[PDB]
């Protein structure tokens, strides 16, 4: 309702967060931000960063790009099978 932060992330980040909805607003955001190599802390993480980031991969569906999609695939599968058994992995 009153969280414009929630609204704009559910605009472009909607599919991404539906792959991992267990993490909270700042918890999912701090994950993807630290994988982007965020220098600041998530308590200072501006919505401008997230929205711009998820719009890059959104515009990759149809853009000026000459076959160059560019979406840095994490081997979370590696970390996942390496962890195993724990409730969240």
Q: What is the CATH number of the domain that holds 13?
A: 1.10.1580.20
70 Rama class: left (phi>0) / alpha (psi -120 to 50) / beta? left
- Cβ neighbours of 18 (radius 10 Å): 9
Which of 12, 17, 21, 18 is closest to 58 using CA atoms?
12
Maximum distance among all alpha carbons in the chain? 44
**Number of domains, the chain:** 1
**Solving technique:** NMR
Polymer length in residues for the chain: 89
Half-sphere exposure of 88 (CA within 13 A, CB side): 6
What range defines the domain where residue 38 resides?
1-89
- Cβ neighbours of 7 (radius 10 Å): 11
């Amino acid at each position: 309702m009153k969280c414009k932060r929630l609204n704009e992330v559910i605009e472009l980040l909607q599919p991404a967060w539906q792959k991992e909805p267990d993490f909270n607003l700042l918890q999912f955001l701090q994950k993807l931000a630290k994988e982007s190599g965020f220098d600041g802390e998530l308590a200072d993480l501006t919505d401008d960063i997230l929205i711009y980031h998820l719009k890059m991969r959104d515009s990759a569906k149809d853009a000026v790009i000459p076959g160059l999609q560019k979406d840095y695939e994490e081997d979370f599968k590696t970390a996942l099978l390496r962890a195993r058994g724990v409730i969240k992995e």
